[PDB]
């Protein structure tokens, strides 16, 4: 009988916000104690940072450019998504006998009649908002109660936030304070039925938390010591503490697999309301560590033997990882990951001697932008981004246009993974790995062709999902609070 | 009967540099255990941010300017040195019937026929370098067996580094690869003849680890995966290791006290081959949190519960608290700590509420450089160093010349502990908190009077320990090799 998975994916969380990661403020008891009675990786990464592109990667197991999952993110009047002849993880463990189920964010496309939602793609139930909630109007809503706003006033001349049930709404806009709770509820009641049914099951939470605006409950309102961040990570993490007491009234911490981890680094141009990177560069929307090498964490009793593991991995190879341990036979498709299960168990090392990174706005003509390989890691271009200014490294600003590099800015991860000093800038053993990652970077870039562009497929208003269905005058009139 | 006190002071370590910080490639398993079964400090801090300040203050437990331990640091040939008129912590502790002993760096001067070293200033024992290890020349020495050289050549046209014995050298230069296990060696029997006495022991181990230049014996060069930083810092991990041992065989350790800091910050200049300081901001020779915020460990089974406390704690008040702890009565002098016993034991709380940072070169006029109370800090002044520099950040290298502030920039650690966003660049809460920062500081300029600077009072090389007395020709022809 395959195990119970439990995969938690947090949005725009840095390496170093994890008390367990040596921050000095965050609050994360649960998460802690999970690191504490598992494996935590030191290097797990992404392929691309930012959520779309990297969700699109962590469901499918392939680089985002392959099914066109490009330019930048899908905004809620998107025409394109998540193609469906694509095969998510989902669809993989449904086949397996897998009850499946999302909870949170999905940003992965909406579509015409909601073409592009969850249950189309694998996902049995699902509760959660089609894409980031900060995409839409928040002026007047509340984020931290009794009546704090959320700052900023998010994206405007837009719909509510829609909170939906499968493919109707529920809430439009939901209430932020009250959001967590809901999703808690949906994913107990999904591993209820499945127990019932003698049925593993398959919870993907979304979380919400940790992107921009912050909100909470009152029980988390002003009680992490770090401030409105602060405050919404110990929601995330209380998240996480009742996800496991559940599994535990269940009795299923050795027969269920827990995972966590973050799409992206943080956004730090939302400053101190934004997320910590840690000893890495830069953060969200750059290919600089700090924007890529996201914390992780694997928990499962009785199997997991805890520890810290050095060893290369992604979001990539959860997908054929998984399907190892549910005995899920993998797809026809060429996945871009690997089997992780020997590392996870023990019984080996890990297959992922590589990684390849590309940028927000990746082309055919300058292909990958970062290579990685064993302990070198390789800045073929470099640039900034907009996510990832206000911080004092100009590198990361916006201002920081994109530069060619050649030879490479060679950096050694081992001894200095805040890429501050450039090797080329030789040795026998440097210039051997030079040699090595500049071919790596032909030979990805000769095989890997770009796919049709999703986000270039344009924008529709009449794709905005509405609670009164022919309303007037739209978006505004769409309402249904809770 | 008062407790076996024992004092680990690491030399130049960041505050992201253990594993239990968060760093990505250290080994530190010992460090990471002794953390996980005790407390661990989030905001440790040391008045300044170099050797022999922080080290006046370790020891005496008032800020550096009062008994002259300024400007910079002292070297070979320097005329001063600690007053004799002051009060050390193995003073306290000997008057109560302790064998204390000293393995490792001084650097708190030796003067004419050694009237500085440490069997002047109470320790019965001792075993180490008069101070820093670079501090003569190294273009010879084997830093890493076989007989790989020790990088830069350190500090030229002076005496090799001694090994003194008490009063007396033993080797000039030691044999680095093994220096740290004569520290052991000693460590061990002071505590095993302490036993014997039914005599508590004091052992302040002043490691030369994590220092420049980087050294280890055979069994840790390459063996860390952070290259000679991480082999260097793997040595001082497993020194602690043994010295836990050794007191596990002695069966001491719930009637044992261990303790771990640092000096001062990072000393980033030495690139790839320097600390880390995380999250924080600049490092080694800057009033930034990097240079003045380091990691520390309480260590006590039976007594110190396991945690991680986000109390405000300081060099300056492990004098009082030691002092408390033993019973021993405190000096007539005024300190400029607090008894942090309540906090360690778990019965109460940190009394010290604020926190006074001088810079590397301080002077009466201008006074204190930064202040923190509570979760707020202010910049006064700000400046540069050179072993700062190297680093992305522009603030910490030497270009950035002492700028003064008014208002001073007003920074919340609690939520911007990297010191990113200015508060005043208004809010009741805040506008409070600077009024008080600022009363504060005019309190401390008006009350502390600057002592005779040590440091100015010249050098004469005449002063160098040299290995054959009245030797010929100086100081090269002062060896004795092991
Ligand atoms: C999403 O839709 C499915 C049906 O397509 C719902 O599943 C049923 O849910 C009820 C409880 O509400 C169970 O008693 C049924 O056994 C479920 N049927 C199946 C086939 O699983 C699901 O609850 C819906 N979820 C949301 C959040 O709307
Ligand atoms: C420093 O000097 C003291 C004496 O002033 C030494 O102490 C004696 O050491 C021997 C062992 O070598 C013991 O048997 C004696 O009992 C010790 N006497 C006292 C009064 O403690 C000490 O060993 C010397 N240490 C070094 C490193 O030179
Ligand atoms: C709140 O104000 C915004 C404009 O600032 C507007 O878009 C929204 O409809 C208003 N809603 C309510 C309930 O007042
Ligand atoms: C080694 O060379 C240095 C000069 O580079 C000199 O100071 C030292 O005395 C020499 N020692 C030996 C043993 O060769
Ligand atoms: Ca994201
Ligand atoms: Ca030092």
Not at 151 to 168: F, M, R, T, W, Y
Request: contains cysteine; glycine residues 10%.
């Amino acid at each position: 009988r395959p195990p119970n998975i439990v995969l938690i994916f947090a949005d725009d969380l840095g390496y170093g916000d994890l008390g367990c990661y040596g921050h000095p403020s965050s609050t994360t008891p649960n998460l802690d104690q999970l690191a504490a009675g598992g494996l935590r990786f030191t290097d797990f990464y992404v392929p691309v940072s930012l959520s779309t592109p990297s969700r699109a990667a962590l469901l499918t197991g392939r680089l985002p450019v392959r099914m066109g999952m490009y330019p930048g993110v899908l905004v809620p009047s998107s025409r394109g998504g998540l193609p469906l002849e694509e095969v998510t993880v989902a669809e993989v463990l449904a086949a397996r006998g897998y009850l499946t189920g999302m909870a949170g964010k999905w940003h992965l496309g909406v579509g015409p009649e909601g073409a592009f939602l969850p249950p189309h793609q694998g996902f049995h139930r699902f509760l959660g908002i089609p894409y980031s909630h900060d995409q839409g109007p928040c002026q007047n809503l509340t984020c931290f109660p009794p009546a704090t706003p959320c700052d900023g006033g998010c994206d405007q001349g837009l719909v509510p936030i829609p909170l939906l049930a499968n493919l109707s709404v529920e809430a439009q806009p939901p209430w932020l304070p009250g959001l967590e709770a809901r999703y808690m509820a949906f994913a107990h009641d999904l591993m209820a039925d499945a127990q019932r049914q003698d049925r593993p099951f398959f919870l993907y939470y979304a979380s919400h938390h940790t992107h921009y605006p912050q909100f909470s409950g009152q029980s988390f309102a002003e009680r992490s010591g770090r401030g409105p961040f602060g405050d919404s990570l110990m929601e995330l993490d209380a998240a996480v503490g009742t996800l496991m007491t559940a599994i535990g009234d269940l009795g299923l911490l050795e027969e269920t697999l827990v995972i966590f981890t973050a799409d992206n680094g943080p956004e730090t141009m939302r400053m101190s309301r934004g997320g910590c990177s840690g000893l890495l560069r830069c953060g969200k929307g750059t290919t600089y560590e700090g924007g890529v090498r996201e914390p992780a964490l694997a928990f499962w009793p009785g199997h997991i033997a805890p520890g810290v593991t050095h060893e290369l991995a992604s979001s990539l190879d959860l997908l054929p990882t998984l399907a190892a341990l549910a005995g899920a036979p993998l797809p026809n498709v060429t996945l871009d990951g690997f089997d992780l299960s020997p590392l996870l168990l023990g019984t080996g090392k890990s297959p992922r001697q590589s990684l390849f990174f590309y940028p927000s706005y990746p082309d055919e003509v300058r292909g990958v932008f970062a290579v990685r390989t064993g302990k070198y890691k390789a800045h073929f271009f470099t640039q900034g981004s907009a996510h990832s200014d206000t911080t004092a490294d100009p590198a990361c600003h916006a201002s920081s246009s994109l530069t060619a590099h050649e030879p490479p800015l060679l950096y050694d991860l081992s001894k200095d993974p805040g890429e501050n000093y450039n090797l080329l800038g030789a040795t026998p053993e440097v210039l051997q790995a030079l040699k090595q990652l500049q071919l790596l970077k032909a030979q990805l870039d000769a095989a890997v062709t770009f796919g049709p562009s999703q986000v270039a497929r344009g924008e529709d208003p009449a794709l905005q999902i509405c609670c009164h269905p022919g309303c007037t005058p739209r978006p505004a009139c769409c309402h249904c609070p809770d």
